[PDB]
Symmetry: C3
Subunit: 335 residues, 3 copies
């Protein structure tokens, strides 16, 4: 009975980081308490100043990743401040009943609610806003993230051997539908509500104007590139709440991948490219063996390079000539 | 030898139901006899009166689901009445040879044919019309359904333990390509043939005008919502003969899912969203644990909510506070 | 250490064939040496004379398939003749480091380079050109193919039993983005560079003008149909470096399929249709049981029949009435 369990309180952190947590644990079930506050805001999503009338959990796209263990109960307080214009709620794909919790968390501006559900299934699961009659708009405008429910004894390979990560990153990929005016330039709207009708018309074409990681073209590049070192295992959590994508690490692999994101199923190994179904989160482990700057991207290369679905991982360490060697550098053809 | 086996005759039923059948059986192989009659007709596919010049097996989209067991022989009589305008045939993905049977079942209006094939592979398999030179048009206009070939000893989990369903529903998802005229309104055609050229032009854009379950926006809602009770296991068969989709049960899961639809392969568990490849049928089991109205939908939320790929399941029973509880209802933020 | 191993030299062959190789081998690791020469050229890609300003490895779309064994080292000399206009490189998804080798193989016209990497993971892997700032254009214009890394002891089923093929075919599927002018006719460009801007505009719509196997509509039909005989097992390697596809054999199955293309993972059996993620290669085995002309195609039937993603396999042998029989040929309906 959940009423008798110890409670713990977790402080969330901004993507692409994930809050401190244990993998395998000796701890018993707990009611794990989180809070998130909705923020509607205009955001610049590309290098030419295009804006999106966005909606977020906790001010970020994606929302922060919440981590618990199988058998825990998630207890979320959702706050919709009076500075917002629209009603919101939350649908946890990790939860059972009431449209994922959406029916129990309808919050108008100035209201808040607290939901509890049992995280009885391991995996990475999408959570997203789903207000009646406005579900697609809230989702594509930025209201999604990941709940990761770890098995109590940690991740396992197909033979039941232990797997682990040394650091975790969370990437949310957002298909955006920004309208254009008669001049062919993207429209800038004074309010969220005014963006609605024109946006729905673009949505219905099924053609995104932009597809971005973590809220903007280039969000995970330059100073904001992800980082690792040779010998470190990274977990890459990838959520796409509305549309399929196909993650790939250039110069690397998915060493162990749960593309449907559910840890009770055996992972696949050695993937070049994996598949995240729209409406899900998946998870890949990779242990770095070579230093350098990798790209992590959606391998529809138009979606990546033209529309924005690509980031970088900068990796320190020693080059390994057994894995790869330039035998002859570029030079004139003989003779 | 099939000539020496006992024959049985099955009466088909209209989707979303599936005809009575056994799962695990003590019965030996049989020649199972079915009949279907093709009906071309204009159908209203949305809430604003848009029509489709449609083509169906047995008067429905999808066609009815045919159920046999591995080792059985399917013997189909296909009838194309003289009231129809076009030639038709049938291609069973469950069958081996002759383009799935299409080469052996070419029936002009006023003709019929009888095909037998051995159902030697377990799974849910698409069947669809495939007349030479007109294959996409016949498929997207409605001529597909599912053949379910059950293992003789019933469904099995990854460890070989028995699985079962207490009721089965069949959902066919149809990407439609309805043309528009200069005024931006959908065109209404007097005959099937007159719809052809304009439809092909829309098809070639790869952008559906509508994506519907079971022939119409809202087909599986209101009085026609699917039904179950807490403690009942439902099988959800999902066919998409032309285009990918990504099924999801809001507030539920795929407890055991064969997304590629082939029962000799281990199922995956705990899925949030699964993937049906265009040209296939898949199958998910779910045991209800909470009462209420669920949505079953394609989790490209634009495809679901804007274009029509969503239905409802109304579930009776007792609410379970351990699985989910509203701890604090929506109320003003403190203080 | 790779420097101490025996070297071997492989002569590549044009798709859809694959160069002679062993499956299970008693041979130890080797440095396997290949050479490929880049050719930019205009190609006719459909039946109405539409041209593509194309770019190829070794003069073909796809490039040839390179076959080695797990533990081998691939040593490629890449040549970019002075008759070409653009810089190129190569990114092997089978390799670890330096953006798949791309950073180490930048070759301007008149240059060549030699890369070595360890093929330490079994599977079919895409290789493709990836020049900085021009990656999508080089890929969609034709610069991709497959590296197949076989396990040293051959392919295995989920229970570890041996699997084999008697012949192998390689199919590359290419989503093309050919621009149109004001008259609605496809544009013909005098040079590769002049095609660039207009092509990028089409790419950004995400709607291919054509989707072809092996460089052209109908490439694998008529005199160029694939061939087999009843009782022969074929391996069908399918690469798609940019966009998802869903292979299907009409009248057949994927008997054993690695849709993510990685041989250390158990294959699935009895597939009707499988899924190749954009940016990957997959592999299916099928043993023919019926003679006749099969179609092998992308089962988005619009993509196949309208846009070009379909080929034929002509199969010799004896018809098997147990698997399929025309019980009653098309004839007038009674009475
Ligand atoms: Cu919202
Ligand atoms: Cu959802
Ligand atoms: Cu037909
Ligand atoms: Cu088919
Ligand atoms: Cu190139
Ligand atoms: Cu790549
Ligand atoms: Zn308590
Ligand atoms: Zn580690
Ligand atoms: Zn008989
Ligand atoms: Zn039951
Ligand atoms: Zn050497
Ligand atoms: Zn053989």
């Amino acid at each position: 009975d959940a009423d008798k369990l110890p409670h713990t309180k977790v402080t969330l952190v901004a993507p692409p980081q994930v809050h401190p947590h244990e993998q395998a644990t000796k701890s018993g079930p707990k009611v794990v308490e989180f809070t998130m506050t909705i923020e509607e805001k205009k955001m610049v999503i590309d290098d030419k100043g295009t804006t999106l009338q966005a909606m977020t959990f906790n001010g970020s796209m994606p929302g922060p990743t919440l981590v618990v263990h199988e058998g825990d109960y998630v207890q979320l307080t959702l706050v919709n401040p009076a500075t917002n214009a629209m009603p919101h709620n939350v649908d946890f794909h990790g939860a059972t009943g009431a449209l994922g919790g959406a029916k129990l968390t309808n919050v108008n501006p100035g209201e808040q609610a607290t939901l509890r559900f049992k995280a009885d299934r391991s995996g990475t699961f999408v959570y997203h806003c789903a207000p009646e009659g406005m579900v697609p708009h809230h989702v594509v405008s930025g209201m999604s993230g990941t709940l990761m429910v770890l098995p109590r004894d940690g991740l396992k390979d197909p033979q039941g051997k232990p797997l682990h990560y040394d650091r975790a990153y969370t990437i949310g990929e957002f298909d955006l539908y920004i309208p254009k005016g008669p001049d062919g330039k993207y429209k800038d709207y004074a309010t969220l509500a005014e963006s609605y009708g024109d946006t729905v018309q673009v949505m219905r074409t099924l053609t995104p104007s932009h597809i971005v990681f973590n809220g903007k073209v280039g969000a995970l590049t330059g100073a904001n590139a992800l980082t690792a070192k040779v010998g470190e295992t990274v977990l890459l959590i990838h959520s796409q709440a509305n549309r399929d994508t196909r993650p790939h690490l250039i110069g690397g692999h998915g060493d162990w991948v749960w593309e449907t994101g559910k840890f009770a199923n055996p992972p696949q190994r050695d993937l070049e490219t994996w598949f995240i179904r729209g409406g899900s989160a998946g998870a890949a482990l990779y242990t770095f063996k070579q230093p350098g700057v990798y790209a992590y991207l959606n391998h529809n290369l138009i979606e990546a390079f033209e529309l924005g679905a690509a980031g970088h991982i900068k990796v320190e360490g020693k080059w390994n000539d057994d894995l790869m060697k330039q035998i002859k550098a570029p030079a004139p053809i003989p003779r």
